[PDB]
Amino acid sequence: KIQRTPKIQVYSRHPAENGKSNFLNCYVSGFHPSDIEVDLLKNGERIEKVEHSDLSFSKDWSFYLLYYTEFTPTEKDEYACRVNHVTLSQPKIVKWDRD
Amino acid sequence: FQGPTSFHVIQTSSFTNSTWAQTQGSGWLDDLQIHGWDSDSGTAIFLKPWSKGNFSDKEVAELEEIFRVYIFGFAREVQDFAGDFQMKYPFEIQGIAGCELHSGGAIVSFLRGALGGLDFLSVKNASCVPSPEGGSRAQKFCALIIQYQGIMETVRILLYETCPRYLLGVLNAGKADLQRQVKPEAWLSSGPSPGPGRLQLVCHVSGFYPKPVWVMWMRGEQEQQGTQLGDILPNANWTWYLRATLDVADGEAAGLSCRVKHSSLEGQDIILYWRGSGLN
Numbered sequence: 001k002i003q004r005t006p007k008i009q010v011y012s013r014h015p016a017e018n019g020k021s022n023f024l025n026c027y028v029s030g031f032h033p034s035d036i037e038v039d040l041l042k043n044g045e046r047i048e049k050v051e052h053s054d055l056s057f058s059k060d061w062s063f064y065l066l067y068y069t070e071f072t073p074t075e076k077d078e079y080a081c082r083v084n085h086v087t088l089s090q091p092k093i094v095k096w097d098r099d
Numbered sequence: 100f101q102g103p104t105s106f107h108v109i110q111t112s113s114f115t116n117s118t119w120a121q122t123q124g125s126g127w128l129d130d131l132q133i134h135g136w137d138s139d140s141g142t143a144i145f146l147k148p149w150s151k152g153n154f155s156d157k158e159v160a161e162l163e164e165i166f167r168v169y170i171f172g173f174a175r176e177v178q179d180f181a182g183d184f185q186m187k188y189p190f191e192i193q194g195i196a197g198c199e200l201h202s203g204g205a206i207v208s209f210l211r212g213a214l215g216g217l218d219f220l221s222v223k224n225a226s227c228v229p230s231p232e233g234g235s236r237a238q239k240f241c242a243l244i245i246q247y248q249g250i251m252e253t254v255r256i257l258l259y260e261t262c263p264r265y266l267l268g269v270l271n272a273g274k275a276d277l278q279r280q281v282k283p284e285a286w287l288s289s290g291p292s293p294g295p296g297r298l299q300l301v302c303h304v305s306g307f308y309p310k311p312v313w314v315m316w317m318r319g320e321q322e323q324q325g326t327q328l329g330d331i332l333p334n335a336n337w338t339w340y341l342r343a344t345l346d347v348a349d350g351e352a353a354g355l356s357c358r359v360k361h362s363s364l365e366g367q368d369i370i371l372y373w374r375g376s377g378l379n
Protein backbone atom coordinates (compact mmCIF):
# COMPACT_ATOMS: atom_id res chain seq x y z
CA LYS A 1 0.00 0.00 0.00
CA ILE A 2 1.19 3.48 -0.92
CA GLN A 3 1.35 5.92 1.97
CA ARG A 4 0.45 9.57 1.52
CA THR A 5 2.38 12.36 3.16
CA PRO A 6 0.56 15.13 5.06
CA LYS A 7 -0.18 18.49 3.55
CA ILE A 8 0.14 21.21 6.21
CA GLN A 9 -1.65 24.58 6.07
CA VAL A 10 -1.23 27.22 8.79
CA TYR A 11 -3.55 30.22 9.03
CA SER A 12 -5.01 32.59 11.61
CA ARG A 13 -8.75 32.79 12.16
CA HIS A 14 -8.59 36.62 12.08
CA PRO A 15 -6.29 39.12 10.39
CA ALA A 16 -3.20 39.34 12.56
CA GLU A 17 -3.15 42.52 14.65
CA ASN A 18 -0.18 42.72 17.01
CA GLY A 19 -1.33 42.28 20.60
CA LYS A 20 -4.89 41.16 19.78
CA SER A 21 -6.00 37.68 20.84
CA ASN A 22 -6.58 35.45 17.80
CA PHE A 23 -6.75 31.80 16.79
CA LEU A 24 -3.99 29.88 15.01
CA ASN A 25 -5.15 26.99 12.79
CA CYS A 26 -3.11 24.08 11.42
CA TYR A 27 -4.96 21.96 8.90
CA VAL A 28 -3.23 18.63 8.22
CA SER A 29 -4.69 16.67 5.33
CA GLY A 30 -4.11 14.26 2.49
CA PHE A 31 -2.24 11.72 4.58
CA HIS A 32 -2.37 7.92 5.02
CA PRO A 33 -2.19 6.02 7.34
CA SER A 34 -3.94 7.98 10.09
CA ASP A 35 -1.30 7.73 12.84
CA ILE A 36 0.13 11.25 13.06
CA GLU A 37 1.57 13.69 15.59
CA VAL A 38 0.84 17.42 15.39
CA ASP A 39 2.12 20.26 17.58
CA LEU A 40 1.67 24.01 17.39
CA LEU A 41 4.89 25.83 18.23
CA LYS A 42 5.75 29.25 19.64
CA ASN A 43 9.36 30.26 18.97
CA GLY A 44 10.15 26.60 18.37
CA GLU A 45 8.61 25.49 21.68
CA ARG A 46 5.53 23.33 22.05
CA ILE A 47 2.24 24.98 23.03
CA GLU A 48 0.46 22.89 25.65
CA LYS A 49 -3.21 23.97 25.42
CA VAL A 50 -3.96 22.94 21.83
CA GLU A 51 -7.33 21.56 20.70
CA HIS A 52 -7.92 19.30 17.73
CA SER A 53 -10.75 17.65 15.81
CA ASP A 54 -11.69 13.99 15.84
CA LEU A 55 -10.29 11.99 12.95
CA SER A 56 -12.05 12.33 9.61
CA PHE A 57 -11.19 11.57 6.02
CA SER A 58 -11.97 12.84 2.54
CA LYS A 59 -13.66 11.14 -0.42
CA ASP A 60 -10.30 9.72 -1.56
CA TRP A 61 -9.84 8.19 1.96
CA SER A 62 -7.02 10.59 2.92
CA PHE A 63 -7.23 11.68 6.56
CA TYR A 64 -7.47 15.26 7.81
CA LEU A 65 -7.35 17.02 11.16
CA LEU A 66 -7.63 20.58 12.44
CA TYR A 67 -5.42 21.73 15.34
CA TYR A 68 -6.03 25.18 16.78
CA THR A 69 -5.32 27.33 19.80
CA GLU A 70 -5.68 30.89 21.02
CA PHE A 71 -2.67 33.14 20.42
CA THR A 72 -1.77 36.82 20.35
CA PRO A 73 0.40 37.75 17.34
CA THR A 74 3.34 40.07 17.91
CA GLU A 75 6.08 41.38 15.63
CA LYS A 76 8.96 39.21 16.84
CA ASP A 77 7.24 35.96 17.89
CA GLU A 78 7.16 33.04 15.45
CA TYR A 79 4.49 30.33 15.27
CA ALA A 80 4.55 27.04 13.39
CA CYS A 81 2.95 23.63 12.94
CA ARG A 82 5.17 20.57 13.35
CA VAL A 83 3.96 17.24 11.97
CA ASN A 84 5.37 13.73 12.25
CA HIS A 85 4.10 10.83 10.15
CA VAL A 86 5.38 7.44 9.00
CA THR A 87 6.01 9.07 5.58
CA LEU A 88 8.42 11.60 7.12
CA SER A 89 11.92 10.75 8.26
CA GLN A 90 12.05 13.90 10.40
CA PRO A 91 9.33 16.25 11.68
CA LYS A 92 8.06 18.70 9.07
CA ILE A 93 7.70 22.29 10.27
CA VAL A 94 5.48 24.88 8.57
CA LYS A 95 5.65 28.37 10.01
CA TRP A 96 2.71 30.77 10.03
CA ASP A 97 3.01 33.78 7.71
CA ARG A 98 0.54 36.68 7.85
CA ASP A 99 1.61 38.00 4.43
CA PHE B 100 -33.07 25.08 2.63
CA GLN B 101 -29.40 25.77 3.24
CA GLY B 102 -26.81 23.84 5.22
CA PRO B 103 -25.98 20.12 5.17
CA THR B 104 -28.22 17.60 3.42
CA SER B 105 -26.58 14.28 4.39
CA PHE B 106 -25.69 12.22 7.42
CA HIS B 107 -22.95 9.67 7.66
CA VAL B 108 -20.94 7.64 10.16
CA ILE B 109 -17.28 6.82 9.62
CA GLN B 110 -15.04 4.04 10.92
CA THR B 111 -11.23 3.90 10.98
CA SER B 112 -9.95 0.54 12.25
CA SER B 113 -6.19 0.34 12.76
CA PHE B 114 -4.63 -3.12 12.95
CA THR B 115 -1.15 -2.99 14.47
CA ASN B 116 -0.64 -6.74 14.78
CA SER B 117 -2.64 -9.94 15.24
CA THR B 118 -3.33 -9.04 18.88
CA TRP B 119 -3.86 -5.26 18.78
CA ALA B 120 -6.44 -3.22 16.86
CA GLN B 121 -8.25 0.02 17.64
CA THR B 122 -11.23 1.75 16.02
CA GLN B 123 -12.25 5.43 15.88
CA GLY B 124 -15.69 6.54 14.77
CA SER B 125 -17.87 9.61 14.44
CA GLY B 126 -21.10 10.90 12.89
CA TRP B 127 -21.37 13.87 10.57
CA LEU B 128 -23.76 16.19 8.76
CA ASP B 129 -21.77 16.80 5.58
CA ASP B 130 -18.47 17.79 7.22
CA LEU B 131 -20.00 19.09 10.48
CA GLN B 132 -19.39 16.62 13.28
CA ILE B 133 -22.40 15.85 15.49
CA HIS B 134 -21.45 12.48 17.06
CA GLY B 135 -18.27 11.24 18.65
CA TRP B 136 -17.52 7.61 19.53
CA ASP B 137 -16.12 7.09 23.03
CA SER B 138 -13.89 4.00 23.09
CA ASP B 139 -13.62 4.35 26.90
CA SER B 140 -17.32 3.50 27.32
CA GLY B 141 -18.42 2.05 23.99
CA THR B 142 -21.09 4.76 23.66
CA ALA B 143 -21.62 7.79 21.48
CA ILE B 144 -20.89 11.39 22.43
CA PHE B 145 -23.64 13.78 21.33
CA LEU B 146 -21.94 17.02 20.34
CA LYS B 147 -25.10 19.14 19.91
CA PRO B 148 -28.25 19.12 22.09
CA TRP B 149 -30.24 18.09 19.00
CA SER B 150 -27.83 15.32 17.88
CA LYS B 151 -30.39 12.59 18.62
CA GLY B 152 -32.76 14.10 16.02
CA ASN B 153 -36.27 12.82 16.64
CA PHE B 154 -35.12 9.40 17.91
CA SER B 155 -36.06 8.24 21.41
CA ASP B 156 -33.44 7.52 24.06
CA LYS B 157 -34.39 3.86 23.73
CA GLU B 158 -33.68 3.62 20.01
CA VAL B 159 -30.47 5.63 20.36
CA ALA B 160 -29.19 3.22 23.00
CA GLU B 161 -30.10 0.27 20.77
CA LEU B 162 -28.08 1.77 17.93
CA GLU B 163 -25.09 2.42 20.22
CA GLU B 164 -25.21 -1.23 21.22
CA ILE B 165 -25.36 -2.31 17.56
CA PHE B 166 -22.26 -0.20 16.89
CA ARG B 167 -20.43 -1.42 20.01
CA VAL B 168 -21.04 -5.06 19.06
CA TYR B 169 -20.13 -4.37 15.45
CA ILE B 170 -16.88 -2.60 16.44
CA PHE B 171 -15.81 -5.55 18.61
CA GLY B 172 -16.85 -8.30 16.21
CA PHE B 173 -15.32 -6.56 13.21
CA ALA B 174 -11.87 -6.45 14.81
CA ARG B 175 -12.24 -10.03 16.08
CA GLU B 176 -13.18 -11.48 12.69
CA VAL B 177 -10.62 -9.44 10.72
CA GLN B 178 -7.89 -10.85 12.97
CA ASP B 179 -9.21 -14.40 12.63
CA PHE B 180 -9.29 -14.28 8.81
CA ALA B 181 -6.18 -12.12 8.26
CA GLY B 182 -4.13 -15.22 7.46
CA ASP B 183 -6.57 -16.52 4.86
CA PHE B 184 -6.78 -13.03 3.30
CA GLN B 185 -2.97 -12.83 3.22
CA MET B 186 -2.92 -9.60 5.23
CA LYS B 187 0.37 -7.96 6.16
CA TYR B 188 0.35 -5.87 9.34
CA PRO B 189 0.03 -3.06 9.98
CA PHE B 190 -3.03 -2.19 7.90
CA GLU B 191 -5.96 0.18 8.21
CA ILE B 192 -9.58 -0.26 7.13
CA GLN B 193 -12.02 2.62 6.63
CA GLY B 194 -15.76 2.70 6.22
CA ILE B 195 -18.42 5.32 5.59
CA ALA B 196 -22.17 4.81 5.53
CA GLY B 197 -25.18 7.09 5.56
CA CYS B 198 -27.73 8.83 3.43
CA GLU B 199 -28.43 12.09 1.69
CA LEU B 200 -31.43 14.13 0.58
CA HIS B 201 -31.51 15.22 -3.10
CA SER B 202 -33.48 17.78 -5.05
CA GLY B 203 -36.94 16.34 -5.57
CA GLY B 204 -36.96 14.82 -2.09
CA ALA B 205 -35.38 11.41 -2.70
CA ILE B 206 -33.07 10.06 -0.01
CA VAL B 207 -30.23 7.87 -1.31
CA SER B 208 -28.07 5.71 0.93
CA PHE B 209 -24.49 4.56 0.59
CA LEU B 210 -21.86 2.41 2.24
CA ARG B 211 -18.21 2.39 1.15
CA GLY B 212 -15.19 0.56 2.55
CA ALA B 213 -11.46 0.91 2.03
CA LEU B 214 -8.27 -1.02 2.74
CA GLY B 215 -4.88 0.64 2.53
CA GLY B 216 -6.45 3.96 1.58
CA LEU B 217 -7.98 2.49 -1.59
CA ASP B 218 -11.60 1.64 -2.35
CA PHE B 219 -12.39 -1.96 -1.39
CA LEU B 220 -16.18 -2.42 -1.54
CA SER B 221 -19.49 -0.59 -1.69
CA VAL B 222 -23.12 -1.56 -1.04
CA LYS B 223 -25.42 -1.21 -4.06
CA ASN B 224 -29.06 -2.35 -3.93
CA ALA B 225 -28.29 -3.88 -0.50
CA SER B 226 -25.60 -6.04 -2.17
CA CYS B 227 -21.85 -6.17 -1.46
CA VAL B 228 -19.94 -5.02 -4.56
CA PRO B 229 -16.15 -5.51 -4.62
CA SER B 230 -14.23 -2.58 -6.05
CA PRO B 231 -11.56 -3.37 -8.69
CA GLU B 232 -8.88 -1.73 -6.53
CA GLY B 233 -9.68 -4.36 -3.88
CA GLY B 234 -8.86 -7.21 -6.26
CA SER B 235 -9.55 -10.84 -5.51
CA ARG B 236 -9.30 -10.06 -1.80
CA ALA B 237 -12.45 -7.92 -2.08
CA GLN B 238 -14.21 -10.61 -4.08
CA LYS B 239 -13.27 -13.06 -1.32
CA PHE B 240 -14.57 -10.68 1.37
CA CYS B 241 -17.93 -10.03 -0.28
CA ALA B 242 -18.57 -13.75 -0.79
CA LEU B 243 -17.76 -14.33 2.89
CA ILE B 244 -19.68 -11.45 4.51
CA ILE B 245 -23.03 -12.30 2.92
CA GLN B 246 -23.00 -15.68 4.67
CA TYR B 247 -22.75 -14.25 8.21
CA GLN B 248 -26.35 -14.51 9.38
CA GLY B 249 -28.09 -11.20 9.96
CA ILE B 250 -25.25 -8.82 9.05
CA MET B 251 -26.72 -8.08 5.62
CA GLU B 252 -30.24 -7.66 6.97
CA THR B 253 -29.07 -5.24 9.68
CA VAL B 254 -27.14 -3.24 7.04
CA ARG B 255 -30.19 -3.09 4.76
CA ILE B 256 -32.45 -1.91 7.60
CA LEU B 257 -29.95 0.65 8.87
CA LEU B 258 -29.15 2.02 5.38
CA TYR B 259 -32.57 2.09 3.78
CA GLU B 260 -35.01 2.41 6.70
CA THR B 261 -33.26 3.90 9.76
CA CYS B 262 -30.97 6.40 8.04
CA PRO B 263 -33.59 8.31 5.98
CA ARG B 264 -35.88 8.92 8.93
CA TYR B 265 -32.91 9.79 11.15
CA LEU B 266 -31.62 12.29 8.60
CA LEU B 267 -34.95 14.09 8.24
CA GLY B 268 -35.44 14.20 12.00
CA VAL B 269 -31.99 15.61 12.69
CA LEU B 270 -32.02 18.17 9.85
CA ASN B 271 -35.23 19.47 11.42
CA ALA B 272 -34.01 19.22 15.02
CA GLY B 273 -30.80 21.09 14.34
CA LYS B 274 -32.09 23.75 11.94
CA ALA B 275 -31.27 26.63 14.33
CA ASP B 276 -27.58 25.77 13.93
CA LEU B 277 -27.69 24.09 10.51
CA GLN B 278 -29.47 26.95 8.72
CA ARG B 279 -28.01 29.89 10.63
CA GLN B 280 -26.20 32.65 8.75
CA VAL B 281 -22.77 33.90 9.84
CA LYS B 282 -21.26 36.87 8.01
CA PRO B 283 -17.64 36.61 6.80
CA GLU B 284 -14.91 39.12 7.39
CA ALA B 285 -12.42 39.87 4.65
CA TRP B 286 -8.96 41.41 4.38
CA LEU B 287 -6.14 41.82 1.88
CA SER B 288 -2.46 40.92 1.99
CA SER B 289 0.52 40.83 -0.39
CA GLY B 290 1.38 37.15 -0.69
CA PRO B 291 4.28 35.13 -2.11
CA SER B 292 5.80 36.73 -5.20
CA PRO B 293 5.28 34.47 -8.23
CA GLY B 294 8.57 35.60 -9.77
CA PRO B 295 10.45 38.61 -11.15
CA GLY B 296 8.57 41.90 -11.53
CA ARG B 297 5.32 40.32 -10.34
CA LEU B 298 3.12 40.27 -7.24
CA GLN B 299 0.53 37.96 -5.72
CA LEU B 300 -2.47 39.69 -4.15
CA VAL B 301 -4.45 37.73 -1.56
CA CYS B 302 -8.07 38.24 -0.54
CA HIS B 303 -8.84 36.38 2.71
CA VAL B 304 -12.43 35.50 3.64
CA SER B 305 -13.00 34.00 7.08
CA GLY B 306 -15.81 33.12 9.47
CA PHE B 307 -18.70 32.49 7.07
CA TYR B 308 -21.48 29.89 7.33
CA PRO B 309 -23.01 28.23 5.37
CA LYS B 310 -20.19 27.04 3.14
CA PRO B 311 -21.18 28.39 -0.32
CA VAL B 312 -19.43 31.70 -1.01
CA TRP B 313 -18.36 33.91 -3.92
CA VAL B 314 -15.00 35.76 -3.96
CA MET B 315 -13.50 37.46 -7.00
CA TRP B 316 -10.75 39.93 -7.84
CA MET B 317 -12.19 42.87 -9.83
CA ARG B 318 -11.13 45.89 -11.85
CA GLY B 319 -14.18 48.06 -11.32
CA GLU B 320 -16.99 45.93 -12.67
CA GLN B 321 -14.75 43.51 -14.64
CA GLU B 322 -14.19 40.16 -12.94
CA GLN B 323 -10.57 39.11 -13.28
CA GLN B 324 -10.59 35.63 -14.81
CA GLY B 325 -7.10 35.18 -13.35
CA THR B 326 -8.62 34.85 -9.86
CA GLN B 327 -7.49 31.62 -8.16
CA LEU B 328 -9.57 30.11 -5.36
CA GLY B 329 -7.73 28.19 -2.69
CA ASP B 330 -9.38 25.28 -0.96
CA ILE B 331 -12.05 25.91 1.66
CA LEU B 332 -10.38 25.41 5.06
CA PRO B 333 -12.15 24.83 8.38
CA ASN B 334 -12.21 27.10 11.38
CA ALA B 335 -13.25 25.84 14.76
CA ASN B 336 -16.96 26.33 15.52
CA TRP B 337 -18.47 25.56 12.11
CA THR B 338 -17.19 28.38 9.90
CA TRP B 339 -14.85 28.37 6.90
CA TYR B 340 -11.81 30.20 5.54
CA LEU B 341 -10.93 30.84 1.91
CA ARG B 342 -8.16 32.62 -0.01
CA ALA B 343 -8.55 34.06 -3.50
CA THR B 344 -5.27 35.08 -5.12
CA LEU B 345 -4.29 36.99 -8.24
CA ASP B 346 -0.85 37.11 -9.88
CA VAL B 347 -0.24 40.57 -11.35
CA ALA B 348 2.62 42.50 -12.93
CA ASP B 349 4.36 44.89 -10.51
CA GLY B 350 2.85 48.06 -11.96
CA GLU B 351 -0.61 46.69 -12.72
CA ALA B 352 -1.86 46.05 -9.17
CA ALA B 353 -3.33 49.55 -8.87
CA GLY B 354 -7.05 49.59 -9.51
CA LEU B 355 -7.74 46.07 -8.24
CA SER B 356 -10.42 45.23 -5.69
CA CYS B 357 -11.83 42.09 -4.08
CA ARG B 358 -15.59 41.49 -3.91
CA VAL B 359 -17.19 38.97 -1.52
CA LYS B 360 -20.75 37.68 -1.87
CA HIS B 361 -22.39 35.46 0.74
CA SER B 362 -25.93 34.47 1.66
CA SER B 363 -25.53 36.08 5.09
CA LEU B 364 -24.88 39.56 3.65
CA GLU B 365 -28.46 40.15 2.42
CA GLY B 366 -27.14 41.41 -0.90
CA GLN B 367 -24.59 43.87 0.55
CA ASP B 368 -21.32 42.58 -0.92
CA ILE B 369 -17.99 43.20 0.83
CA ILE B 370 -15.57 45.23 -1.33
CA LEU B 371 -11.88 45.71 -0.48
CA TYR B 372 -9.61 47.95 -2.54
CA TRP B 373 -5.91 47.27 -3.08
CA ARG B 374 -3.81 50.43 -2.72
CA GLY B 375 -0.30 50.86 -4.09
CA SER B 376 2.96 51.84 -2.39
CA GLY B 377 2.36 50.03 0.91
CA LEU B 378 -0.78 51.97 1.82
CA ASN B 379 -2.39 48.57 2.59
Ligand SMILES: *[C@@H]1O[C@H](CO[C@@H]2O[C@@H](C)[C@@H](O)[C@@H](O)[C@@H]2O)[C@@H](O[C@@H]2O[C@H](CO)[C@@H](O[C@@H]3O[C@H](CO[C@H]4O[C@H](CO)[C@@H](O)[C@H](O)[C@@H]4O)[C@@H](O)[C@H](O[C@H]4O[C@H](CO)[C@@H](O)[C@H](O)[C@@H]4O)[C@@H]3O)[C@H](O)[C@H]2NC(C)=O)[C@H](O[C@@H]2O[C@@H](C)[C@@H](O)[C@@H](O)[C@@H]2O)[C@H]1NC(C)=O
Pocket residue numbers: 153154155263264265267268271
Ligand atom coordinates in the same frame (compact mmCIF):
# COMPACT_ATOMS: atom_id res chain seq x y z
C1 LIG C 1 -38.71 11.06 12.64
O1 LIG C 1 -39.08 11.86 11.54
C2 LIG C 1 -39.39 11.15 10.34
C3 LIG C 1 -39.78 12.22 9.33
O2 LIG C 1 -40.89 12.94 9.84
C4 LIG C 1 -41.39 14.01 9.02
O3 LIG C 1 -40.43 15.03 8.83
C5 LIG C 1 -40.04 15.76 10.02
C6 LIG C 1 -38.93 16.74 9.60
C7 LIG C 1 -41.25 16.43 10.63
O4 LIG C 1 -41.82 17.29 9.66
C8 LIG C 1 -42.26 15.33 11.01
O5 LIG C 1 -43.41 15.93 11.61
C9 LIG C 1 -42.65 14.51 9.76
O6 LIG C 1 -43.55 13.42 10.10
C10 LIG C 1 -40.52 10.14 10.58
O7 LIG C 1 -40.64 9.32 9.42
C11 LIG C 1 -41.85 9.57 8.67
O8 LIG C 1 -42.98 9.15 9.40
C12 LIG C 1 -44.23 9.33 8.72
C13 LIG C 1 -45.32 8.91 9.67
O9 LIG C 1 -45.47 9.86 10.71
C14 LIG C 1 -44.24 8.52 7.43
O10 LIG C 1 -45.45 8.83 6.75
C15 LIG C 1 -46.12 7.65 6.27
O11 LIG C 1 -45.69 7.32 4.97
C16 LIG C 1 -46.34 6.18 4.38
C17 LIG C 1 -45.77 5.99 2.98
O12 LIG C 1 -44.37 5.81 3.10
C18 LIG C 1 -43.93 5.08 1.94
O13 LIG C 1 -44.09 5.86 0.76
C19 LIG C 1 -43.33 7.09 0.68
C20 LIG C 1 -43.64 7.76 -0.66
O14 LIG C 1 -45.02 8.14 -0.67
C21 LIG C 1 -41.82 6.78 0.86
O15 LIG C 1 -41.09 7.99 0.90
C22 LIG C 1 -41.60 5.99 2.16
O16 LIG C 1 -40.23 5.71 2.30
C23 LIG C 1 -42.45 4.71 2.18
O17 LIG C 1 -41.95 3.89 1.11
C24 LIG C 1 -47.85 6.41 4.34
O18 LIG C 1 -48.48 5.24 3.86
C25 LIG C 1 -48.38 6.76 5.74
O19 LIG C 1 -49.77 7.03 5.65
C26 LIG C 1 -50.50 6.60 6.81
O20 LIG C 1 -50.40 7.54 7.84
C27 LIG C 1 -50.88 8.86 7.50
C28 LIG C 1 -50.62 9.77 8.68
O21 LIG C 1 -49.29 9.59 9.11
C29 LIG C 1 -52.37 8.78 7.14
O22 LIG C 1 -52.80 10.06 6.72
C30 LIG C 1 -52.59 7.76 6.02
O23 LIG C 1 -53.99 7.67 5.74
C31 LIG C 1 -51.98 6.41 6.38
O24 LIG C 1 -52.79 5.90 7.46
C32 LIG C 1 -47.62 7.95 6.30
O25 LIG C 1 -47.91 9.08 5.46
C33 LIG C 1 -43.04 8.92 6.57
O26 LIG C 1 -42.97 8.10 5.41
C34 LIG C 1 -41.75 8.79 7.37
N1 LIG C 1 -40.61 9.21 6.57
C35 LIG C 1 -39.55 8.41 6.37
C36 LIG C 1 -38.45 8.98 5.52
O27 LIG C 1 -39.48 7.30 6.86
C37 LIG C 1 -40.24 9.26 11.79
O28 LIG C 1 -41.40 8.49 12.04
C38 LIG C 1 -41.08 7.13 12.38
O29 LIG C 1 -40.72 6.38 11.24
C39 LIG C 1 -41.76 6.17 10.28
C40 LIG C 1 -41.12 5.35 9.15
C41 LIG C 1 -43.05 5.55 10.92
O30 LIG C 1 -42.82 4.23 11.39
C42 LIG C 1 -43.50 6.41 12.09
O31 LIG C 1 -44.65 5.78 12.71
C43 LIG C 1 -42.34 6.55 13.09
O32 LIG C 1 -42.72 7.33 14.19
C44 LIG C 1 -39.85 10.12 13.00
N2 LIG C 1 -39.50 9.31 14.15
C45 LIG C 1 -38.50 8.40 14.16
C46 LIG C 1 -38.27 7.68 15.46
O33 LIG C 1 -37.85 8.15 13.15
Ligand SMILES: *[C@@H]1O[C@H](CO[C@@H]2O[C@@H](C)[C@@H](O)[C@@H](O)[C@@H]2O)[C@@H](O[C@@H]2O[C@H](CO)[C@@H](O)[C@H](O)[C@H]2NC(C)=O)[C@H](O)[C@H]1NC(C)=O
Pocket residue numbers: 115116117118119
Ligand atom coordinates in the same frame (compact mmCIF):
# COMPACT_ATOMS: atom_id res chain seq x y z
C1 LIG D 1 1.16 -5.67 19.21
O1 LIG D 1 1.15 -4.24 19.35
C2 LIG D 1 1.04 -3.81 20.72
C3 LIG D 1 0.87 -2.31 20.71
O2 LIG D 1 1.75 -1.67 19.79
C4 LIG D 1 1.86 -0.28 20.18
O3 LIG D 1 0.72 0.46 19.75
C5 LIG D 1 0.48 0.53 18.32
C6 LIG D 1 -0.70 1.48 18.13
C7 LIG D 1 1.73 0.97 17.52
O4 LIG D 1 1.86 2.39 17.55
C8 LIG D 1 3.03 0.29 18.02
O5 LIG D 1 4.12 1.01 17.47
C9 LIG D 1 3.13 0.29 19.55
O6 LIG D 1 4.31 -0.40 20.01
C10 LIG D 1 2.26 -4.28 21.51
O7 LIG D 1 2.12 -3.87 22.86
C11 LIG D 1 3.38 -3.47 23.45
O8 LIG D 1 4.09 -4.57 24.09
C12 LIG D 1 5.29 -4.22 24.81
C13 LIG D 1 5.75 -5.49 25.48
O9 LIG D 1 4.80 -5.92 26.45
C14 LIG D 1 5.03 -3.09 25.81
O10 LIG D 1 6.24 -2.68 26.44
C15 LIG D 1 4.36 -1.91 25.12
O11 LIG D 1 4.10 -0.87 26.05
C16 LIG D 1 3.07 -2.40 24.49
N1 LIG D 1 2.30 -1.30 23.94
C17 LIG D 1 0.96 -1.23 24.07
C18 LIG D 1 0.30 -0.04 23.46
O12 LIG D 1 0.32 -2.11 24.66
C19 LIG D 1 2.33 -5.80 21.43
O13 LIG D 1 3.48 -6.30 22.11
C20 LIG D 1 2.36 -6.26 19.98
N2 LIG D 1 2.37 -7.71 19.89
C21 LIG D 1 3.20 -8.38 19.08
C22 LIG D 1 3.08 -9.88 19.13
O14 LIG D 1 4.00 -7.81 18.35
Ligand SMILES: CCCCCCCCCCCCC/C=C/[C@@H](O)[C@@H](N)CO[C@@H]1O[C@H](CO)[C@H](O)[C@H](OS(=O)(=O)O)[C@H]1O
Pocket residue numbers: 108126143150151159162163164165166168169172173196197210249250253254257258261262265
Ligand atom coordinates in the same frame (compact mmCIF):
# COMPACT_ATOMS: atom_id res chain seq x y z
C1 LIG E 1 -27.12 7.32 17.54
C2 LIG E 1 -27.76 8.31 16.55
C3 LIG E 1 -27.23 8.02 15.14
C4 LIG E 1 -28.31 7.28 14.33
C5 LIG E 1 -27.64 6.46 13.19
C6 LIG E 1 -28.72 6.05 12.18
C7 LIG E 1 -28.12 6.13 10.75
C8 LIG E 1 -27.77 4.72 10.25
C9 LIG E 1 -26.35 4.77 9.66
C10 LIG E 1 -26.18 3.66 8.61
C11 LIG E 1 -25.02 2.75 9.09
C12 LIG E 1 -25.07 1.38 8.37
C13 LIG E 1 -23.64 0.77 8.42
C14 LIG E 1 -23.58 -0.23 9.59
C15 LIG E 1 -22.77 -1.31 9.51
C16 LIG E 1 -22.73 -2.29 10.67
O1 LIG E 1 -23.18 -1.66 11.83
C17 LIG E 1 -23.65 -3.49 10.36
N1 LIG E 1 -22.90 -4.49 9.66
C18 LIG E 1 -24.20 -4.08 11.66
O2 LIG E 1 -23.98 -5.47 11.69
C19 LIG E 1 -23.65 -5.89 12.96
O3 LIG E 1 -22.50 -6.82 13.01
C20 LIG E 1 -22.19 -7.34 14.37
C21 LIG E 1 -21.48 -8.65 14.23
O4 LIG E 1 -20.21 -8.44 13.66
C22 LIG E 1 -23.40 -7.49 15.31
O5 LIG E 1 -24.05 -8.74 15.05
C23 LIG E 1 -24.34 -6.37 15.05
O6 LIG E 1 -25.38 -6.09 16.05
S1 LIG E 1 -26.60 -7.15 16.45
O7 LIG E 1 -26.91 -6.97 17.92
O8 LIG E 1 -27.92 -6.75 15.80
O9 LIG E 1 -26.25 -8.59 16.14
C24 LIG E 1 -24.82 -6.54 13.69
O10 LIG E 1 -26.08 -5.88 13.50
Ligand SMILES: [Cl-]
Pocket residue numbers: 041042043044045078079080095
Ligand atom coordinates in the same frame (compact mmCIF):
# COMPACT_ATOMS: atom_id res chain seq x y z
CL1 LIG F 1 8.46 28.39 15.40
Ligand SMILES: [Cl-]
Pocket residue numbers: 137138139140141142167170
Ligand atom coordinates in the same frame (compact mmCIF):
# COMPACT_ATOMS: atom_id res chain seq x y z
CL1 LIG G 1 -15.80 0.47 21.86
Ligand SMILES: [Cl-]
Pocket residue numbers: 140141167171
Ligand atom coordinates in the same frame (compact mmCIF):
# COMPACT_ATOMS: atom_id res chain seq x y z
CL1 LIG H 1 -16.78 -2.62 24.32
